[PDB]
């Protein structure tokens, strides 16, 4: 259970959580309600594990891509903004928070990666990925390196993998097809091979993570990095003379970065949905609210039309929207967490030389497709299990699930998740239909 008359917010560690807490202080000064902001590790995975048992934050912040899975699991309260509030945010930002025709979260800002470069080490940054090896050889001579970015998260290496034809799923006829997956194609292979070749040629180390790349660029050791708006405030602190520009092209095609919409969703198990709505609509989604988060770690291109009119003057936001128009919006389908686990595995294995590009991507394509196919089976099984009212079959199912041990009894319900059950136990449930 979640405490009443108190709001608890969860947001990622790379976002402006101290600035968000400053907005919670204004909320407390005007209403009396205490607001507590937390930034757990792996919060995208913690939220489904705690919100199922009625615990967790009242508000959760993440990009839109994970919200579809939370909505299908019944974890999110359906937000109902009045017509006049909806006109304050850009229409395409509300589309990213729409699942099954319902609005499941409040859009906050649009993010996309950009090429961030150091003007004192490299005033003319490369326009192509292919000229980075020669540039690195020229920079190493001067005691520096060309490029360093997070190689541990597929979000960062995706601009290059999608450049020549890679894609998450086909969005054929206004609906994503979980069968058509563009990870094994020749465009994705061409992209990831280029990346692996940079590492084999010592132009990059496969062990580079977020922190290593952040410190090397901010200390002046590397000429370029690939990061989002949230990173700008730390670069300012380092006093590095930096620019934010277009991501380089690969095989004449532009790098296609994933575009995410930072969203705030209200937990369905929370008794503070009234306070959460008041906080998000009248405190956070205002020029003053967004400015407090943006001053901590930049949001990018905010969803609020009035505050975006001020930020549009910023050439770093122009670079962000330039890269965002060239990339792809993140799909919001519930098997996106399985898609991400697959691409993350293939990228790391190929980068480290543990698998070839063709082998790594074939396994990713195979797993993403299989995990999505099985999840749709579970969604059809769930729809039929809720239409079931025959107390006889319900008792037989309650008994089969009792044998497995995969269940929990609450004051009013007998709970169990179809995802937690063995693929064998699911086949038994089909026989009951």
């Amino acid at each position: 259970k979640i405490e009443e008359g108190k709001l608890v917010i969860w947001i990622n560690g790379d976002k402006g959580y101290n600035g968000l807490a400053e907005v919670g202080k204004k909320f407390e000064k005007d209403t009396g309600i205490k607001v507590t902001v937390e930034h757990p590790d792996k919060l995208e995975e913690k939220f489904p594990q705690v919100a199922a048992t009625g615990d967790g934050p009242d508000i959760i912040f993440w990009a839109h891509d994970r919200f579809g899975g939370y909505a299908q699991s019944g974890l999110l309260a359906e937000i109902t903004p009045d017509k006049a509030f909806q006109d304050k945010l850009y229409p395409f930002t509300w589309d990213a928070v729409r699942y099954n025709g319902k609005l499941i979260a409040y859009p906050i800002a649009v993010e996309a990666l950009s090429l961030i470069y150091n003007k004192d080490l490299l005033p003319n940054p490369p326009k192509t990925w292919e000229e980075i090896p020669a540039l690195d050889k020229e920079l190493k001579a001067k005691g520096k390196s060309a490029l360093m970015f997070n190689l541990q998260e597929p979000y960062f290496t995706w601009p290059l993998i999608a450049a020549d034809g890679g894609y998450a799923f086909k969005y054929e006829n206004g609906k994503y097809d979980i069968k058509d997956v563009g990870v094994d194609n020749a465009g994705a292979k061409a992209g990831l091979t280029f990346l692996v070749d940079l590492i084999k040629n010592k132009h990059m180390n496969a062990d580079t993570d977020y922190s290593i790349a952040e410190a090397a660029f901010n200390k002046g050791e590397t000429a370029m990095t690939i990061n989002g708006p949230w990173a700008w405030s730390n670069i300012d602190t380092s006093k590095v003379n930096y620019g934010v520009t277009v991501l380089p092209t690969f095989k004449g095609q532009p790098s296609k970065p994933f575009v995410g919409v930072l969203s705030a969703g209200i937990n369905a198990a929370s008794p503070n949905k009234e306070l959460a709505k008041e906080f998000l609509e009248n405190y956070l989604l205002t020029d003053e609210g967004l400015e407090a988060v943006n001053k901590d770690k930049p949001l990018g291109a905010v969803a609020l039309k009035s505050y975006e009119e001020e930020l549009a003057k910023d050439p770093r936001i122009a670079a962000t929207m330039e890269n965002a128009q060239k990339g792809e919006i993140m799909p919001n389908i519930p098997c996106m967490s399985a898609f991400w686990y697959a691409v993350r595995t293939a990228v790391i294995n190929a980068a480290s030389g543990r698998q070839t590009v063709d082998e790594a991507l074939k396994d990713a394509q195979t797993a993403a497709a299989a995990d999505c196919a099985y999840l749709d089976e579970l969604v059809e099984l769930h729809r039929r299990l809720m239409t079931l009212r025959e107390r006889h079959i319900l008792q037989q199912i309650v008994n089969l699930i009792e044998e497995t041990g995969h269940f929990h009894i609450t004051n009013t319900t007998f709970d169990f998740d179809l995802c937690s059950l063995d693929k064998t136990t699911v086949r038994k449930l089909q026989s009951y239909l």
Binding site: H382, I397, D417
Partner: peptide, 5 residues
């Protein structure tokens, strides 16, 4: 997530 009365 399945819940049963």
């Amino acid at each position: 997530p399945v819940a049963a009365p």
